[PDB]
Amino acid sequence: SESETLNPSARIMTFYPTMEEFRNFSRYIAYIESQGAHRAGLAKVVPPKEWKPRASYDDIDDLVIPAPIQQLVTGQSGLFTQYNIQKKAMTVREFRKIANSDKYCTPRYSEFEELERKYWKNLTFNPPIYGADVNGTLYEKHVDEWNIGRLRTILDLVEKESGITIEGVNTPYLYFGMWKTSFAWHTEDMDLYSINYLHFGEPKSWYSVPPEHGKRLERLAKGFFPGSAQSCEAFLRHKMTLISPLMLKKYGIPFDKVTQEAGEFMITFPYGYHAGFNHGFNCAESTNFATRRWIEYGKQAVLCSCRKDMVKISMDVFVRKFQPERYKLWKAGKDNTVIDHTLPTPEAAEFLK
Ligand SMILES: NCCNC(=O)c1ccnc(-c2cc(C(=O)O)ccn2)c1
Ligand SMILES: [Cl-]
Ligand SMILES: [Cl-]
Ligand SMILES: [Cl-]
Ligand SMILES: [Cl-]
Ligand code: NA
Ligand code: NI
Ligand SMILES: [Zn+2]
Known part of the structure; x- marks a missing residue:
C-alpha cells in the first residue's frame, strides 16, 4: 500500500535537485524512487x-x-x-x-x-539520418557528478568480475539527431535503467508506458505484428516498432509524454517502455545503470530469441552477491519471486523512515 500510494497516477515526475543532492548519483536515484518516480517508467x-x-x-x-x-x-x-x-x-x-x-x-x-502531429504525419517520408550509437563521451575528464562514463552503480559488477564490456550498456553512447529521427518502443537491454543527457541542440520528445502496464503494451504489439511475434519471443527488442500515441489511446494503454531540453537528464526505469523522436539537430549521451531493485528484473527479463549478438548479461554474480539465500533455488529454476513494479529500490529506505 505505502509504495502504491506514491505517484498513484504514475505520471512522469520532474526533479530539481540542489548541487548537494545532485552529487550522490545512486542516492538521488533512490530518492526519486522514494517519491514514486519509477512508476511512470521515465523521469526528468x-x-x-x-x-x-x-x-x-x-x-x-x-x-x-x-x-x-x-x-x-x-x-x-x-x-x-x-x-x-x-x-x-x-x-x-x-x-x-x-x-x-x-x-x-x-x-x-x-x-x-x-x-x-507533423511527426506522426510525415514519419514515412524523407527518411532522415541518425548519428546513433557513437562510442564516446562529451563529459570533461574531471566532472564528478552524474558522469555517464562513471556513475559507479552495481552494474559495474559486470566488467569488474568478467572484464566484459557491452557498448552503450556499460559504456557511453552518443547520439546525434536531426528532425524526425526516431527511437522505437522498447525497454532497455536486460530491463536495466538508463540515463540520457541532452548535451545541446533541439529537444528530444519521449513517450513512456508505466512498467505496471508494460505487459498490456506487449499484448497490443503482438496483436498488431503477429508475424514478428511468432518469429521472436521479444521482437520489441529489435527496436524497430513505432506506435503512435493515438493508437495507444484507442486501445486503452496508459502512457505519458514529456519533452527533454538541452541541459536536462532523462532516467528510464526497469521495464519502462519508451519511444520518441528528435526535434532537430542535437546531441545526447546515454548508458545503462542498475540498483539492487533491478536484479530481479534482470533475472526475469524476456530476451530476443532470434538474433545473433543480442545483449545478455549473466545474472549469476548478482544473485550470489545480493540474493545468496535464493541462489540455489534460482539455479534450480524454482525461484518464483513476483515483481511488484510499485516498490522503490531498497536503497531508498533512508528516505522512507
Ligand atoms: N542500436 C543498438 C544499441 N542500443 C539501442 O539502440 C538502445 C537501447 C536502449 N535505449 C535506447 C534509447 C535511445 C534513445 C535516443 O535515440 O535518444 C532514447 C532512449 N533510449 C537505444
Ligand atoms: Cl525536486
Ligand atoms: Cl507482423
Ligand atoms: Cl530500427
Ligand atoms: Cl534480448
Ligand atoms: Na557499435
Ligand atoms: Ni532506451
Ligand atoms: Zn529477436
Whole structure:
C-alpha cells in the first residue's frame, strides 16, 4: 500500500535537485524512487544551474560518426516498422550541415502539439539520418557528478568480475539527431535503467508506458505484428516498432509524454517502455545503470530469441552477491519471486523512515 500510494497516477515526475543532492548519483536515484518516480517508467532531472559537464562544444566538428543510419519507416494508421540503412562514416560537421539543410531541417510550428502531429504525419517520408550509437563521451575528464562514463552503480559488477564490456550498456553512447529521427518502443537491454543527457541542440520528445502496464503494451504489439511475434519471443527488442500515441489511446494503454531540453537528464526505469523522436539537430549521451531493485528484473527479463549478438548479461554474480539465500533455488529454476513494479529500490529506505 505505502509504495502504491506514491505517484498513484504514475505520471512522469520532474526533479530539481540542489548541487548537494545532485552529487550522490545512486542516492538521488533512490530518492526519486522514494517519491514514486519509477512508476511512470521515465523521469526528468534538471541539474543545478551551476552544473556543466563540459565548458564548450566548439571543438567537436571533427568527431567521427562511423555508422550513420538512414531511417526508412513503413506503415500506416499509427503502426510502423523502421528499417535501418547504414551510410558511410561522416564527421559531426558533415552531419550538422545535412541536419540543418532545407531538406532535413525542422519544419515551422507554434506549439509542441503541432510539431508532434507533423511527426506522426510525415514519419514515412524523407527518411532522415541518425548519428546513433557513437562510442564516446562529451563529459570533461574531471566532472564528478552524474558522469555517464562513471556513475559507479552495481552494474559495474559486470566488467569488474568478467572484464566484459557491452557498448552503450556499460559504456557511453552518443547520439546525434536531426528532425524526425526516431527511437522505437522498447525497454532497455536486460530491463536495466538508463540515463540520457541532452548535451545541446533541439529537444528530444519521449513517450513512456508505466512498467505496471508494460505487459498490456506487449499484448497490443503482438496483436498488431503477429508475424514478428511468432518469429521472436521479444521482437520489441529489435527496436524497430513505432506506435503512435493515438493508437495507444484507442486501445486503452496508459502512457505519458514529456519533452527533454538541452541541459536536462532523462532516467528510464526497469521495464519502462519508451519511444520518441528528435526535434532537430542535437546531441545526447546515454548508458545503462542498475540498483539492487533491478536484479530481479534482470533475472526475469524476456530476451530476443532470434538474433545473433543480442545483449545478455549473466545474472549469476548478482544473485550470489545480493540474493545468496535464493541462489540455489534460482539455479534450480524454482525461484518464483513476483515483481511488484510499485516498490522503490531498497536503497531508498533512508528516505522512507
Ligand atoms: N542500436 C543498438 C544499441 N542500443 C539501442 O539502440 C538502445 C537501447 C536502449 N535505449 C535506447 C534509447 C535511445 C534513445 C535516443 O535515440 O535518444 C532514447 C532512449 N533510449 C537505444
Ligand atoms: Cl525536486
Ligand atoms: Cl507482423
Ligand atoms: Cl530500427
Ligand atoms: Cl534480448
Ligand atoms: Na557499435
Ligand atoms: Ni532506451
Ligand atoms: Zn529477436
